[PDB]
Every structure is written in C-alpha cells, then in structure tokens.
Amino acid sequence: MIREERLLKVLRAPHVSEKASTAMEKSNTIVLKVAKDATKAEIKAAVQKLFEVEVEVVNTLVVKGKVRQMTVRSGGRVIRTSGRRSDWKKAYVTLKEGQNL
Amino acid sequence: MKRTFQPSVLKRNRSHGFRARMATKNGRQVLARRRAKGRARLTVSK
Amino acid sequence: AAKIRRDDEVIVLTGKDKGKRGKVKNVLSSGKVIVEGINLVKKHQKPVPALNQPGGIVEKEAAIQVSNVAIFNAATGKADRVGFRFEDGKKVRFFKSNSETI
Amino acid sequence: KAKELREKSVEELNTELLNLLREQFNLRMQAASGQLQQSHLLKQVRRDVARVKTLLNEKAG
Amino acid sequence: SRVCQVTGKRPVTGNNRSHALNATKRRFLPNLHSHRFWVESEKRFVTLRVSAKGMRVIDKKGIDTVLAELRARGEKY
Amino acid sequence: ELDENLFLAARNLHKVDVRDATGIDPVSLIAFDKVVMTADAVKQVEEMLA
RNA sequence: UAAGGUGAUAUGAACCGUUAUAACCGGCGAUUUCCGAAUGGGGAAACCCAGUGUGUUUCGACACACUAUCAUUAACUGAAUCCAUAGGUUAAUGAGGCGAACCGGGGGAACUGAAACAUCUAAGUACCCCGAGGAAAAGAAAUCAACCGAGAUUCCCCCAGUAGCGGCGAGCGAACGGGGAGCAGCCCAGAGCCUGAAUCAGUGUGUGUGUUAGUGGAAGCGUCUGGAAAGGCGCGCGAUACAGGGUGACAGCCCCGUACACAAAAAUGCACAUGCUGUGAGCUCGAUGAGUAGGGCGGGACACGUGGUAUCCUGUCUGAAUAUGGGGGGACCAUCCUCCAAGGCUAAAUACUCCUGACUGACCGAUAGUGAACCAGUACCGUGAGGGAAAGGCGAAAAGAAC
Numbered sequence A: 001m002i003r004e005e006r007l008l009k010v011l012r013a014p015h016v017s018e019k020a021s022t023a024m025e026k027s028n029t030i031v032l033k034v035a036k037d038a039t040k041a042e043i044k045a046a047v048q049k050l051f052e053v054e055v056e057v058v059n060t061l062v063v064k065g066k067v068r069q070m071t072v073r074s075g076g077r078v079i080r081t082s083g084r085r086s087d088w089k090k091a092y093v094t095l096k097e098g099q100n101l
Numbered sequence B: 001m002k003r004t005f006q007p008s009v010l011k012r013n014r015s016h017g018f019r020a021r022m023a024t025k026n027g028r029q030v031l032a033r034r035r036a037k038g039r040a041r042l043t044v045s046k
Numbered sequence C: 001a002a003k004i005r006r007d008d009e010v011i012v013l014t015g016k017d018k019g020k021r022g023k024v025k026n027v028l029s030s031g032k033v034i035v036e037g038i039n040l041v042k043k044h045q046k047p048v049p050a051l052n053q054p055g056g057i058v059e060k061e062a063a064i065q066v067s068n069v070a071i072f073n074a075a076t077g078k079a080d081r082v083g084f085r086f087e088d089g090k091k092v093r094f095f096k097s098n099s100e101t102i
Numbered sequence D: 001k002a003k004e005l006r007e008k009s010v011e012e013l014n015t016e017l018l019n020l021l022r023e024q025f026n027l028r029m030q031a032a033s034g035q036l037q038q039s040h041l042l043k044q045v046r047r048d049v050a051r052v053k054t055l056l057n058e059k060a061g
Numbered sequence E: 001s002r003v004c005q006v007t008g009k010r011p012v013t014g015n016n017r018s019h020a021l022n023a024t025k026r027r028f029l030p031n032l033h034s035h036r037f038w039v040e041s042e043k044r045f046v047t048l049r050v051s052a053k054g055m056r057v058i059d060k061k062g063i064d065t066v067l068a069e070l071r072a073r074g075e076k077y
Numbered sequence F: 001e002l003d004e005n006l007f008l009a010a011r012n013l014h015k016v017d018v019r020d021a022t023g024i025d026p027v028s029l030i031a032f033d034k035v036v037m038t039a040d041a042v043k044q045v046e047e048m049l050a
Numbered sequence G: 001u002a003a004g005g006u007g008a009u010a011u012g013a014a015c016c017g018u019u020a021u022a023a024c025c026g027g028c029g030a031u032u033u034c035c036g037a038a039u040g041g042g043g044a045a046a047c048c049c050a051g052u053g054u055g056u057u058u059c060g061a062c063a064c065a066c067u068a069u070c071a072u073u074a075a076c077u078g079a080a081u082c083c084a085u086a087g088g089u090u091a092a093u094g095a096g097g098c099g100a101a102c103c104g105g106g107g108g109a110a111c112u113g114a115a116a117c118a119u120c121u122a123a124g125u126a127c128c129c130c131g132a133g134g135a136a137a138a139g140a141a142a143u144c145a146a147c148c149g150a151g152a153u154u155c156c157c158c159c160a161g162u163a164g165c166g167g168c169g170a171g172c173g174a175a176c177g178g179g180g181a182g183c184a185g186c187c188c189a190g191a192g193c194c195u196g197a198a199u200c201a202g203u204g205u206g207u208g209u210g211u212u213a214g215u216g217g218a219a220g221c222g223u224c225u226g227g228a229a230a231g232g233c234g235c236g237c238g239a240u241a242c243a244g245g246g247u248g249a250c251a252g253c254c255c256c257g258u259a260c261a262c263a264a265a266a267a268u269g270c271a272c273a274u275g276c277u278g279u280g281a282g283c284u285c286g287a288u289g290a291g292u293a294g295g296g297c298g299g300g301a302c303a304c305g306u307g308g309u310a311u312c313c314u315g316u317c318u319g320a321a322u323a324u325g326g327g328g329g330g331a332c333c334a335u336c337c338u339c340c341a342a343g344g345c346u347a348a349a350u351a352c353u354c355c356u357g358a359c360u361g362a363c364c365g366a367u368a369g370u371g372a373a374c375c376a377g378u379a380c381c382g383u384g385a386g387g388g389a390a391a392g393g394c395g396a397a398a399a400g401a402a403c
Helices: A004-010 A018-027 A040-050 B009-016 B025-037 D002-007 D010-032 D040-059 E052-061 E063-073 F004-010 F026-031 F039-049
Strands: A011-014 A029-034 A055-063 A067-073 A078-084 A088-095 C009-012 C021-028 C032-035 C040-045 C056-061 C069-072 C082-087 C090-095 E012-017 E023-028 E032-039 E044-051
Touching: A004 A011, A004 A040, A004 D010, A011 A040, A011 D010, A018 A029, A029 A040, A040 A055, A040 A088, C009 C032, D002 D040, D010 D040, E032 E052, E032 E063, E044 E052, E052 E063
Parallel strands: none
Antiparallel strands: A011 A029, A029 A088, A055 A088, A067 A078, C009 C021, C009 C069, C021 C032, C040 C056, C082 C090, E012 E023, E032 E044
C-alpha cells in the first residue's frame, strides 16, 4: 500500500485552462499537475485521500518543456541566455459523482 | 542528389555513443582527452 | 567591528556636503551609507500605475562612502575617530580624541 | 526550534513530521490557487520538515 | 603466451644483421615445449610448458622442488 | 656592530639606511647624500679593503 | 563573529533579526536522486527488467536489505575412478576506476644529417604499453687503484671536447683522478648459551609546535583653486606601522589594512615523553647463494660500429672449482695486488607541479598576455576523432533623462 508521505508528495497543483474547465463541466474530470514520476495508482490514491472524492480513472501525459530565452546582466553587461523549462506530468482525473474545488 | 549525411539515431549511437566509447580502451582514451579539454558534450549521446 | 551603525549622528567630511550632519539610515554592504537628507538627488520617476503613480521628479538620499563621514562627538562638537576596547567582556566603541565610550 | 524538538520522542517526532507534511501540502495548494499572500511560510515549513527528520535520523543511533 | 613456466624465459628482441650490416628488428623465441611430468608424490602427470633449459633444470632439481617454486610464485599448473 | 635599537628606529624613515659595514655596496654609497661611519666601521672597512 | 540579513540577476513581495539560539565564517556530523569502475541481469550514459529475504498491508499492494567479476583463505560436498583430485556452493579479506609532471620497466620509428645514399646519424628520441611512489631508481665492492692507497649509492663543478670510437666520413665521446652537497649501515642462507636484550613498526594518553575561524592596532586641522581635495599654502602629530589597496584629482594621520602583540569547543600534521602490542638484542660454534661462473653460436649494452676486444646481459647448445677455491686489473700468459658473484633490505643530498598560500618582476596590457580579462573549450564547423572564434571601458554617484 502507498504510504501517506508519498501521497502528500505526488500532487503539485490544479491546472487552470479552458480545456480543464470544459473537462470539469462536461465530464466531471479534474486536471492536475503531478510529480513527473507519479503513477496512475499513486494519483488515484492521493486524490481519493487528500480530496475525499471517489475516483473513476486516471489518464496521464508528460508535457515537454519549451525553450525560454531571456537576458541576465553580469557585471554591467547584458548577456542572452537560453534554456529549457522542465517537463511535468498532467493528470486527467475522472470523478465518480463527487464535487471538488 | 544524395548527400553523405543520411541520419539514423540508432546507427549514430551504436557507432559514436557513450557505451561504444566505453567498450574499448582507445574509445576510453577518446573520452579522457575530451574530459581534459573540458568539452561540454562528451559524446553524441543525447 | 563596523564603526558606523544605524542611529549614528555623523558629519560629512567630503563632497559638497562638508559639515552637514545627519543620522545614518542604512549601512549598505558595499561600504556605503544612507544619511538622513544629505546626498540628495533628483530622480526622474517614470509613471507606473500598477504600484506607484505618474511619478514626477522626486528627491532621495543617495548612498555615500563610509570613509566620507565621521562619527560626531557632540561633546567637543567636532568629527572624531572611533576605536574599540573591552569593558566587562563586551566590545565597545569609544571616541579616540576623548576616550569616552559611545 | 531544535531544542524542544529534541525533548520529544521518536513517535512524537513522527506525528510532527506527518503534520508538517500535511501543512506543506495545504500551503502548496493555496499558493497554486492564487491565495497565500504570506509566501514566507513555504520556506518555513520546508526547513521545519528538514529539522524534524534530522532529529529523527539522529535519534536512531 | 610464449613463456616458460620454470625459468620464465620469454621472447626477446634483437637485430637481424646482414653482410652489409643492415639492421632489421627480429625476435628470439624460447625453445618451448609442452611436457607431461610424472609427479611421484601426487601419483599423477602434470603438464607444463617448458623450455629445454627448464627441462634440464627439472632434471637437476627434481619436479617437486620446481613445483613448490611455481606455487610460491603463484603460477598455476 | 648591528644595533637592533638603531635598526628598528630607522625602518620607517625612507631616506635613512643602517648598514653593518660588511653590507656596504657600491650603489648605496653613491645613492645617499651623506654617509656616516663609526670609527669601528672605518677600521672594519679598511680591513676588508686592505 | 555580529547589526544587519533572505547568493548574482534583484527591483519587488513576504519575512527574519538588533546584548545572547538573524545572517556570515571555521571544526565535526546528518542528508546526499540518477548515470558513470557501476558491481543483481541487460542497454543506444543518465534507461528497461528482476531474484531472494525481512517487515507492513485498508489485500490493491508497499518499504527496506542483499544478489558483479577476479585473487587469496576457510568450511561444506564431490566426476570419469577405488582412495583422491578436477569441479560446485557459501563465507571472509583485498582489488578494480580516475588523475599534470617527475620515476622504473616491456616494445620502438621516420623525416633529417652525411651537401646523393645503404654502414652510421637522428635516437633509445617521438610514440604505444605495464607498474609505483611522494619521490622513484640505485646502493654497502667477486669496485677502483698501482706496489702508494682509497673505501656503498645519488647529485653538482672539473678532468675534457682530452683518451678513444668512426663509410677514421658526418658525427659520437669516456674514465682515472680532484673539488663539493649529503652521509647510518644491516639481515637471511643456524644451532646452542642467555633470552623480549634496547631495536623498529602499530595503538592509547600527555606536552610542545603548526594548520583549519578570529582579536586589538596610531597619529590633522585651517585656508586657496576646484563639481569633488588626498593637490597648493600654513601650522601640527604617529612611526618596531611611509607594504599595499580604497575613498568625487596625488592621503603616514578618512577607511581597510600594515609593524607589533594576542586567540581555539573541535578536528588534524609534525616532534618529543610515556603505556601496551608483535619484533628482535648479545656471546660461542658454524655455514658462505650450480644448470650458476666460464665456453660455442646469434644478438644487444658498454664513449668503444668485431676491431688485437677486455667487461656486462642472454635467445640457443653446454658446463666448473667450490676458500690449500674463485672473480678482476682492456687480447693473452706469468708474477703480485685487490676483491668474494650466482639471496635480500636500507634515510639524505636528486627529479617534478594537476593543486594551496604568501611574495616578486628593466614580463603583457585587449590584433598583446592563456584559445579564453567577457557565461570559452562556448557559438560555430565536422559522421567522428577532432578543429575552434569574435566579443573589455557612461558617470564620482544612475542622479541612466519626470513632463
């Protein structure tokens, strides 16, 4: 069985978008950001425990980060820097009949 | 016309990859030289 | 081991404000201080409605070098140098010209 | 903080750790949802958790 | 490799010299042979790769002494 | 002789040099405006220079 | 150690702190994902898949530990085959990989020079490979010398571009002896008598001295020019401190320092002094390193190219004497001189600098100095090995231009 500390780790944030809002209002589906190494069983247990709702099924995907470019000044001189935003995991959690936040 | 570079990731890794460099002592010497130079990318492995 | 703290009455030694006195407001880590109403500059404040307002031209204290100010004795009425000594196992500052603790 | 934490026992330290982890999760949800004007609480709870399990690891021999 | 297990003789390098004294690198090889030696004490045959010089040494010292020497050096037979 | 009292008192004066009559060198004799020698130093310098 | 802080970007936000448990600095701990020798198996580095135990469970499952190979040792069991070996399983200990030069060893060029070129040179150099240490190697005369004597190795200066070697060409190039740095010699091949008999390594305490944070440090004002004074002028003061750096122009006395004098909970280096642990002392009798020295054949090393060729090493074939014996003294013999091979160990003087601290420079100053003063082994180029840049300066202060 999954320990409670793991469950308190795996849930990162609710994900806000019009796709997420439409999913909630159509299919009773909750979209979250989760830890990149969280399995579907872990997400199911975490939602069922920390949110006190009953979960039907979890769908997950990994989002690759984009390249972001911005400048940093280093000793009276602006230099252009480039780097990639970190990947993250998105969970589509379908609720049986409960209401969430 | 067909040009010389005809990419293929599998062939690239099997020829010049990290595990291919580590398999022989000459390839291990290639890696040591690149570490001594301070190369940001040791191999084609990505 | 600083010789200049916050509520120190200092006197400016150099730089178009000689003889003016004021309290130290901040001690910057770069060896500079903000002294109340001495090193005044006119800032052309750009408008930012998010937090500030139209801006206008404002007057602020600019930082001045710590080497450019001296602790004010207020007993001799002159600038003074400050040394360190131990009293009851506590480091204290004293005026060098007077040997009195600050 | 480490003093009265050291006064507690292993089982009390585990209860404290669990409470801190729940508090951390609640703060994370608040921060994500746009609440939590007091951003400084995140670092506070993070350092409290580190302290608690430092004490826990030093109790176990 | 081409090493005698008793004396340790191994290939050495030298020069081929012609009548005009042209020097080309060459190799001198030991006179290596594989021989089954009868060990009276152990009632068995031990096979060693030995040079003819090593075989003379075994004749002089006896097989048990040289086997003890090989064990001391850690050589496997 | 080398007097440590004299040596220490002259360190911080930059146009004064105290020497040992065996540490004299050609440049320092020309460089300074005046050269002061004690009589013992004079005899020692004679001995060195024969 | 502290009145300031939450690294740069950085403004802000939300906060922490003000004798003391904010921050910062040092010692010792804790945590330390994944890959990588990578080691449970695999693999196209940073990923895929397990087995066995222990524990937990809400029966969905979860957590933790172990499981590479080789070497050595031990236990168990165990083929042909009777005993037995080989083999197998399991334990314990060790190794493995990386790293700049210096060091020892195994292999080892060519260009070039010879005004061509093959002997010769370049050169045992470049390079490849193995192994180690803080140094390594060598080292205690089967050495020289010369009828007198020295007394182990190593390194420096001479001897000396000498004697010699040499298609006697190009070129290579010593020793003897002298001056210095440094300087201890020991053990086994063996028994008795005495017997831990100091010795040398390891460990534990004590002292001393360093290292890893720190503390105190001593003295200047007026006036002129000026945006600003540290400059000019005037009058003072410190100095075991006038090294250096900063501050609105050039400061001994404004600041940080400097001379000088102090400092350590803790961890450590080096010296000593002790406690214990193995160690062995001293004496008398002995013994004195054999497929070895030497030889024939082929090579190599010696300054020495086979030459009249001493000496050393050995791939191959042989092969002594063994202390009234043996080696060497530049073919060889005789005298007489000197030494004792075929077993080992051994500090210092010597070589180097990936790295740390301090200091110095008739060294550079942005096309220079490192390729790189700058977010450079980067951008970019190449399948890859690999190649490889250009790019510093507002101002004292952003006061960096409200309207």
